[PDB]
Ligand binder design. Sequence first.
Ligand SMILES: CCCCC[NH2+][C@@H](CC[C@H]([NH3+])C(=O)O)C[C@H]1O[C@@H](n2cnc3c(N)ncnc32)[C@H](O)[C@@H]1O
Ligand SMILES: [Zn+2]
Ligand SMILES: [Zn+2]
Ligand SMILES: [Zn+2]
Length: 234
Amino acid sequence: GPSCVMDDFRDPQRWKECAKQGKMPCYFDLIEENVYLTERMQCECTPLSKDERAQGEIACGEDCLNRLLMIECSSRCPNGDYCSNRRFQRKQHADVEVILTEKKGWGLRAAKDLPSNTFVLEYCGEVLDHKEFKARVKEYARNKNIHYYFMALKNDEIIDATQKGNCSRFMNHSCEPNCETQKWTVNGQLRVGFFTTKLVPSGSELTFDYQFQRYGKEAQKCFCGSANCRGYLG
Ligand SMILES: CCCCC[NH2+][C@@H](CC[C@H]([NH3+])C(=O)O)C[C@H]1O[C@@H](n2cnc3c(N)ncnc32)[C@H](O)[C@@H]1O
Ligand SMILES: [Zn+2]
Ligand SMILES: [Zn+2]
Ligand SMILES: [Zn+2]
């Protein structure tokens, strides 16, 4: 159908008028970082030379101890600004577009080829404690037309993407997905991101397996079209 770049989502008034025309998804409150509703490690990498970086060597690449432990480097990194392990902080998300699919509503696609383990986008939302989550579950169990999406960070920290979020709201489900969520520590805070699990060619829909989040006592029929399709997302 039609397509949308992430900048289109940054003008609320132009967005609302495109959604009435069916040219953009339904309006929602866009946030580019988690909002908390209640007030709540150097790597052993050798800093790379000018000659090393030019010859193709990766600063805080696959061998970074921080990276292997899913910890981003701080501003105190030996590799400084050339450090490739500060993706959440530097907002180094993938080139992605929002597209209308045939059967699954709006979806996310790769606008460039994305190698395996590429940061796609952060899973953003309102972060809830115990009590707020309990009140929200109760409020949702009345509305019934509400499709609730939760991602636990830790026990007293649950991401709610149902009302506020970013374009990771458009990530559809697949039974044979090409993305996964990963939970990272970023300057002491737990953050979750979508990361590709294979090379995703340009134009390919970006998908994840919904079983790794908390969502709907309801069970939607599945149009992922995978050979291994389980028939439902419930
Ligand atoms: C924060 C990550 C998930 C945040 C929720 N994301 C929406 C997708 C955005 C929607 N597409 C739109 O248009 O806004 C979930 C809903 O999409 C639908 N959906 C998805 N995947 C399949 C499938 N595989 N088969 C059928 N429907 C699907 C179904 O209604 C489901 O509740
Ligand atoms: Zn490192
Ligand atoms: Zn680093
Ligand atoms: Zn399926």
